[PDB]
Each structure stands twice: as structure tokens, then as C-alpha cells.
Enzyme design. Structure first.
Site, short mmCIF file in Angstrom:
data_model
loop_
_atom_site.label_atom_id
_atom_site.label_comp_id
_atom_site.label_asym_id
_atom_site.label_seq_id
_atom_site.Cartn_x
_atom_site.Cartn_y
_atom_site.Cartn_z
N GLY A 58 4.53 7.72 2.91
CA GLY A 58 5.47 6.72 2.39
C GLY A 58 4.78 5.49 1.83
O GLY A 58 3.59 5.26 2.07
N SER A 59 5.54 4.71 1.05
CA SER A 59 5.04 3.46 0.46
C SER A 59 5.60 2.28 1.22
O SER A 59 6.68 2.36 1.80
CB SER A 59 5.42 3.36 -1.02
N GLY B 245 0.82 -1.21 0.00
CA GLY B 245 0.00 0.00 0.00
C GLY B 245 0.84 1.26 0.00
O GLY B 245 2.04 1.22 0.29
N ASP C 53 1.42 4.28 13.44
CA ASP C 53 1.25 5.73 13.23
C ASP C 53 1.16 6.62 14.47
O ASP C 53 0.34 7.53 14.50
CB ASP C 53 0.00 5.98 12.40
C1 LIG Z 1 -5.09 2.78 6.65
N1 LIG Z 1 -3.90 2.35 7.42
C2 LIG Z 1 -3.53 1.03 6.88
C3 LIG Z 1 -2.21 0.49 7.42
N2 LIG Z 1 -1.23 1.54 7.76
C4 LIG Z 1 0.14 1.17 7.89
C5 LIG Z 1 0.57 -0.17 7.90
C6 LIG Z 1 1.93 -0.46 8.03
C7 LIG Z 1 2.28 -1.91 8.07
C8 LIG Z 1 1.75 -2.80 7.14
C9 LIG Z 1 2.06 -4.15 7.23
N3 LIG Z 1 2.81 -4.61 8.25
C10 LIG Z 1 3.32 -3.77 9.17
C11 LIG Z 1 3.05 -2.41 9.11
C12 LIG Z 1 2.85 0.58 8.19
C13 LIG Z 1 4.31 0.38 8.37
C14 LIG Z 1 5.07 -0.31 7.43
C15 LIG Z 1 6.45 -0.50 7.60
C16 LIG Z 1 7.07 0.01 8.72
C17 LIG Z 1 8.43 -0.15 8.95
C18 LIG Z 1 9.00 0.37 10.10
C19 LIG Z 1 8.25 1.08 11.03
C20 LIG Z 1 6.88 1.27 10.84
C21 LIG Z 1 6.26 0.76 9.71
C22 LIG Z 1 4.90 0.92 9.50
N4 LIG Z 1 2.41 1.84 8.20
N5 LIG Z 1 1.06 2.12 8.06
C23 LIG Z 1 -1.61 2.93 8.04
C24 LIG Z 1 -2.81 3.29 7.19
CL LIG Z 2 -0.05 2.39 3.35
#
Ligand SMILES: CN1CCN(c2cc(-c3ccncc3)c(-c3ccc4ccccc4c3)nn2)CC1
Ligand SMILES: [Cl-]
Ligand SMILES: CN1CCN(c2cc(-c3ccncc3)c(-c3ccc4ccccc4c3)nn2)CC1
Ligand SMILES: Fc1ccc(-c2n[nH]cc2-c2ccncc2)cc1
Length: 336
Positions: A33-34, A28, A165
Site C-alpha cells: 500500500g501507499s 512512501g 508491520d
Molecule cells: C521500510 N519501512 C519504512 C516505513 N514503513 C511503514 C511506515 C508507516 C508509517 C509512516 C509514517 N507514520 C506512521 C506509519 C506505515 C503505516 C502508515 C499508515 C498506517 C495507517 C494505519 C495503520 C498502520 C499504518 C502504517 N506502514 N509502513 C514500512 C517500511
Molecule cells: Cl511505505
């Protein structure tokens, strides 16, 4: 020393990561960020890798990038998203432009689950317990989440949950924020938890406001208009004026409104959805509520090490924030 990086394009986005991370597939893309799922060859684990978007485009982005990294480096708790790794393909400060973050891959978010199923009471207990346990830790470090909502709670098939978040945000926001109070405390998060729990129990959004005014109206309709003790704390003349100009409404009986739910869950909701923030139950106190008897263990609900937020009041140059972020990338020590 430095590892070998490889490059590829995924959804019009460039990804330059170390060879240890393989099989990148997009999960996503956020406004900040991606994210790609990947296989970490060094651990045998599935991980999520987030590439920050335009991290040093402005003083605001630069400071936000630094904030994010400092927060993530500090969070070490089962129910709070943490860092497995952080890297940049840059070999020195002058070429530093991208920041990549790595954490355990989580399969879904709480929003994805509440839509599909209606949860049993046992599931509501374990999910809320985990949220509070994470929040106790976050609050102990003098940090306020401010944006808890189902979509910011990651959950795996095993019902394990992590706060991320740290469906409109507005629906889970505390009333004092709708009133634009600038001195709100950590209890705004307890309000959001109350809203999340009610939704898990009923399968419906508790306060689906269409704007800030409507949101406030839906809230006061359930908990009543402010009593005298709470009115005395409102310094804003216009807000105070507005609130007092509304038709008075009594607090509803929660047992009637959430009838069918476990009476203990109801008791707790009533302690979380209190209009006056000084009277809401704290995360620590909530963990001890009888509703969590099956999960509560005071010896395993830790607090965080002190967190230095003094940088929040600083006004630095973009290169200064960039350099501080760089030092934080370089000093990172992965977990055991
Ligand atoms: C609508 N939401 C959906 C999910 N969101 C996410 C998910 C992730 C994620 C997804 C899958 N597995 C773990 C985390 C992340 C994410 C993804 C990668 C990360 C790496 C290091 C620290 C934090 C991180 C957070 N951010 N927003 C915020 C918006
Ligand atoms: Cl996302
Ligand atoms: C330029 N050389 C060295 C770097 N390269 C690598 C490195 C690794 C690696 C991964 C983790 N630690 C050290 C080195 C891998 C690598 C190593 C192990 C793997 C196991 C399963 C699947 C893919 C795998 C890929 N491939 N090329 C390409 C050739
Ligand atoms: F209508 C309302 C809704 C919420 C509040 C409120 N709850 N806790 C703190 C406040 C509050 C709001 C504005 N200014 C000071 C304090 C006060 C009035």
C-alpha cells in the site's frame, strides 16, 4: 452518517478520502500500500493514511486485508501502531473496493536514525525497552511478529517508538527460521531484538548474511555450533545432517566481542542471542532485566485482550473475505 469525500491523484495513485483529512502529501509506497501524511481537521493532528493496494485481487490478498484490519483493530498499546480510523468511499458492499487506514504520523524509522548517529547507551535502553514493552503486549495475545527489523520500527523526534508491520529482513531472522523449522515460537522475535540492540550499540549489522546459508554461518560463528541438547530437537534429517557436518565452533565470549558496551547490555544480549529458542529470555522477563531499571514499571507494561486467530485456518471465497472486511470497517469504533 457518511461524510463527504474528495478525490485526487498522488504519484499515479488515486486517493478518495473524507474532507476531515487535508493536505495529503506522499510519504512512501510499499508493496502492500501507499502512504500519505495528512492533517486531521477534527483532532488537530498530523496523521498517516495508508491506502491498501489491490486488497481483494485474490483469495490471498482478501485474507491478508482481513488479517491486517483485524490485527490493527485489536492493537491498543503505546508501542504498537494502532488505528485512529478506517474508511472506504463505498456506500455499500457491492461497490466495496478500497480500504484506507489512518494512524498517528511518525517522522522516521529506526533504520533512518542508526545510519545518521551512533546512539548513546541511554537511547539504546529506552528504544529497546519500548520494543520489548510492545512485544510483551503482542506476545500476550498469542501473536508472533516474525519480521522485526529496524525499518519496521517507527520513531519520532521525542524517541517514542512503535512497532509496525506485525536492509535485508534476513539479517534479523532467527537461525531456526534459516533452518526452515515449521514449529518456531514467539522467541524468534527476541532473537531479532537481540540483533537490533547489538546494531544500536556497535553501529554495525551483527549478521549481514548474503543468503540463508551465509546467514547461518555468521550466527554460529558468534554463538557456536549447537550443543547436544539442541541437536536432539532437530527432526529434519537433512538439516541435522548439515549442522553436524560443519566444523564445530565454540561460543564466543560476548564481553570480548561487544567490549566497550555497558556490561548490563552485554548480559541481556547474551540472554537474547541464545541458539536454543527454548532458552531465550521472554519479552516479559527481559523487561525486568537490570539494564532497564530506569524505565521498568511492572504496573505499566500491560498485556492484550484475547485475540481470535481461528480465521487463519479458514478457506473462504473472495466475496466472503471481502464481506468480513466490510463488517470490520463498519463496526470500527474510534479511540477516546
Ligand atoms: C521500510 N519501512 C519504512 C516505513 N514503513 C511503514 C511506515 C508507516 C508509517 C509512516 C509514517 N507514520 C506512521 C506509519 C506505515 C503505516 C502508515 C499508515 C498506517 C495507517 C494505519 C495503520 C498502520 C499504518 C502504517 N506502514 N509502513 C514500512 C517500511
Ligand atoms: Cl511505505
Ligand atoms: C461539500 N461541502 C461539505 C464538505 N466540505 C468540507 C468539509 C470540511 C469538514 C472537515 C471536517 N469535518 C467536517 C467538515 C472541511 C474542512 C473543515 C475544517 C477545516 C479546517 C482547516 C483546514 C481545512 C478544513 C476543511 N472543508 N470542506 C466541502 C463543502
Ligand atoms: F544450527 C541450529 C540453529 C538453530 C537451531 C534451533 N534453535 N531453536 C530451535 C532450533 C531448531 C531448529 C530446527 N529444528 C528444530 C529446532 C538449531 C540448530
Amino acid at each position: 452518517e457518511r461524510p463527504t469525500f474528495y478525490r485526487q491523484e498522488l504519484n499515479k495513485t488515486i486517493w478518495e478520502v473524507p474532507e476531515r483529512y487535508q493536505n495529503l502529501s506522499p510519504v512512501g509506497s510499499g508493496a502492500y500500500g501507499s502512504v500519505c501524511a495528512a492533517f486531521d481537521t477534527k483532532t488537530g493532528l498530523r496523521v498517516a493514511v495508508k491506502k491498501l493496494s489491490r486488497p481483494f485481487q485474490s483469495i490471498i490478498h482478501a485474507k491478508r486485508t482481513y488479517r491486517e484490519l483485524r490485527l490493527l483493530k485489536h492493537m491498543k498499546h503505546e508501542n504498537v501502531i494502532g488505528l485512529l480510523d478506517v474508511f472506504t468511499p463505498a456506500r455499500s458492499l457491492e461497490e466495496f473496493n478500497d480500504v484506507y487506514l489512518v494512524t498517528h504520523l511518525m517522522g522516521a524509522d529506526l533504520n533512518n536514525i542508526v545510519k545518521c548517529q551512533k546512539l548513546t547507551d541511554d537511547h539504546v535502553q529506552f528504544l529497546i525497552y519500548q520494543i520489548l514493552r510492545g512485544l510483551k503486549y503482542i506476545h500476550s495475545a498469542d501473536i508472533i511478529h516474525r519480521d522485526l527489523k529496524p525499518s519496521n520500527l517507527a520513531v519520532n523526534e521525542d524517541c517514542e517508538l512503535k512497532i509496525l508491520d506485525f536492509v535485508a529482513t534476513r539479517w534479523y531472522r532467527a537461525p531456526e527460521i534459516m533452518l526452515n523449522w515449521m514449529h518456531y515460537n514467539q522467541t524468534v522475535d527476541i532473537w531479532s531484538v537481540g540483533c537490533i540492540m547489538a546494531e544500536l550499540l556497535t553501529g554495525r549489522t551483527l549478521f549481514p548474511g548474503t543468503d540463508h546459508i551465509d546467514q547461518l554461518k555468521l550466527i554460529l560463528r558468534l554463538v557456536g555450533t549447537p550443543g547436544a541438547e539442541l541437536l536432539k530437537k532437530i527432526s529434519s534429517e537433512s538439516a541435522r545432517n548439515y549442522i553436524q557436518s560443519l566444523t564445530q565452533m565454540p561460543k564466543m565470549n560476548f564481553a570480548n566481542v561487544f567490549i566497550g558496551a555497558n556490561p548490563l547490555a552485554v548480559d541481556l544480549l547474551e540472554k537474547m542471542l541464545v541458539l536454543d529458542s527454548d532458552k531465550r529470555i521472554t519479552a516479559a522477563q527481559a523487561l525486568a532485566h537490570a539494564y532497564f531499571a530506569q524505565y521498568h514499571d511492572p504496573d505499566d507494561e500491560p498485556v492484550a485482550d484475547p485475540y481470535d486467530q481461528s480465521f487463519e485456518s479458514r478457506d473462504l471465497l473472495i466475496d466472503e473475505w471481502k464481506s468480513l472486511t466490510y463488517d470490520e470497517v463498519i463496526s470500527f469504533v474510534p479511540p477516546p
